[PDB]
């Protein structure tokens, strides 16, 4: 649990295929991801939840999270608590892909940039009323001095 962030994070350990060492990354956990689960990332990675792969490979209508705005920026879009992006169409020419953001806007991105399949875990926070000034104070104490 990351303070100031509704969505939980997941620690994933890889192995570096250049030196004898274990690399560790802190991804944003998607719904259904559990401990002791193998997660794959690459062009040949299969279409499963919590599996990051380029948007060009994924077929149309796929729900993705932590979408890369630019190829190699390591995730910028649809990563708040439960938001997700949907791929609309693919353009083999010029290597372009259309995605629909949770705000409703449609943006054209390169097909090289990757995204994580599934929705962000922890959605539905805004449904519960705060009911108290104290709970709002505790919520905003971990973010900023703006409440």
């Amino acid at each position: 649990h990351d303070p100031g962030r509704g969505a939980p994070l997941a620690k994933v350990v890889f192995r570096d295929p250049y030196r004898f060492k274990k690399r560790t990354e802190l991804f944003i956990a998607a719904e259904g991801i559990h401990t002791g689960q193998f997660v794959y990332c690459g062009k040949k990675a299969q279409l499963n939840i919590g599996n990051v792969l380029p948007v060009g490979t994924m077929p149309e209508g796929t729900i993705v999270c932590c979408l890369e705005e630019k190829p190699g920026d390591r995730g910028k879009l649809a990563r708040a608590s439960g938001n997700y992006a949907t791929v609309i169409s693919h353009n083999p020419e010029t290597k372009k892909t259309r995605v629909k953001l949770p705000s409703g806007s449609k943006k054209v991105i390169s097909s090289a940039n990757r995204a994580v399949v599934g929705v962000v875990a922890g959605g539905g926070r805004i449904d519960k009323p705060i009911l108290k000034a104290g709970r709002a104070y505790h919520k905003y104490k971990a973010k900023r001095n703006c409440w």
Partner: protein, 91 residues
């Protein structure tokens, strides 16, 4: 309706915050504090640890789920759609 008539879990809030707000938060509280059945061991020990974090006492497994419920309907629909797309693509 043993001790309270129609408040139940939101009886701790007393007369404050309004009737409709307490009624709205009642279902959220019940879902949040309920213990679910873990579909790894078969025991009813799935408990909410944090926002979107669910842990099993026996399996010691942590599952990333919804904020107030173990599974959200949107997540289930997305999982079904992803499985359908995988079957259509890989074949």
């Amino acid at each position: 309706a043993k001790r309270t008539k129609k408040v139940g879990i939101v009886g701790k809030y007393g007369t404050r915050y309004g009737a409709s707000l307490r009624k709205m938060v009642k279902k959220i509280e019940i879902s949040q504090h309920a213990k679910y059945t873990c579909s790894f061991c078969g025991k009813t020990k799935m408990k909410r640890r944090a926002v979107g974090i669910w842990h099993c006492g026996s399996c010691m497994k942590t599952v990333a789920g919804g904020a107030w419920t173990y599974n959200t309907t949107s997540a289930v629909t997305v999982k079904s759609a992803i499985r359908r797309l995988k079957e259509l693509k890989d074949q």
